[PDB]
Amino acid sequence: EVQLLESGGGLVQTGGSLRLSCAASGFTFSSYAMTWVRQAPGKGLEWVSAIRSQGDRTDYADSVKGRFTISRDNSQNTLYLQMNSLRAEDTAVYYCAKNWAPFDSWGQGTLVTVSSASTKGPSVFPLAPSGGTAALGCLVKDYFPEPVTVSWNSGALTSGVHTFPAVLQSSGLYSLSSVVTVPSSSLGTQTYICNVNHKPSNTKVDKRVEPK
Amino acid sequence: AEGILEDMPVD
């Protein structure tokens, strides 16, 4: 089983540094060039950097030349990306990929946010319920950086659930809602709890939402 | 496989 697994993303101050690693298994690492592709939120794919099988030759996109160094340890089956003088344009999900081109195996991505803003954990506010359908939810408000995680009833309830893409408020902070529609008459015979997790700030919240 | 560039050449 081929696996690529990035590590090392998170919030970074503008002009700061970060190193990413990508652990590989399931193929003979020392036979392939390895690659870093990135994707800004809501945007397309950008090739970032590539390194020869033996660590022998490196190449870069012009936007990162002189600030990013790609490297690899073939004793450790690990690919690295050292990132200096980071700017907001560098904010993206960073993917590890196999081959010089094209890319058959990709990692899961790691999110790198480049900003001056501090980390802020969200507040979680209940959206209470009053066709015959009711709707309830949670407002996960004023957090930074992305992402947050929402499940309902520790993952048991999934159907009728809608978790929305966060919005960037003009304050610089994110807000998202997650809702569930349920039959009105289930309101007295079910407990509804949203499980919110914001790993950047180590925040975890379970809020029961109650009828009015 | 033709059309897969598994590796970069030496330069």
Add this chain to the structure above:
Amino acid sequence: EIVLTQSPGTLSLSPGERATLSCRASQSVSSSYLAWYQQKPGQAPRLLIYGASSRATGIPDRFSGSGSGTDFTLTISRLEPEDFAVYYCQQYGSSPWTFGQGTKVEIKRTVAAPSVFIFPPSDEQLKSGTASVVCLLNNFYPREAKVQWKVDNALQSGNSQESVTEQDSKDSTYSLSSTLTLSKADYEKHKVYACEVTHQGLSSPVTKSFNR
């Protein structure tokens, strides 16, 4: 640099129809070194075609690719439900490697009118000194929808934000969340809060409201 121009931006088709996606290059692509990827929300990209026309491993034979020089085509002969994603082309004929801007393929289905719900600010949020009013449009199609906020019957402008889920895998609809933001002070000065939804499944705009 080789610029890749994908078209159409968005393609909307009922399942079983033929999808045709175009990729044009600003320079000729050496050796027909052109790849096609599929990318679903929150997932890494997936290789479909390499060398302009060769299918990757485990790719159903309804994906086919053709072209050379500057004009390339990805054909999906019968659109299956698992096919509705973003499609990127990528050239590796000359450095640096570049991707096109992507084509969104959505599934067309019959019109479905939203059901609409409005949530007052939670008391918890009012204690902390802000006020968010939330309006929900549930399982509608097509995507296009006009959501308008009224406060004591005055049309709001510029103080709301909205977000849309991806197309639901069971009934192919969208849902929408709109958040109206106002100060706690102004919220407690007004009585009627209304969410006015316009959608082609509705014979005329629908309004949900509550009195503070």
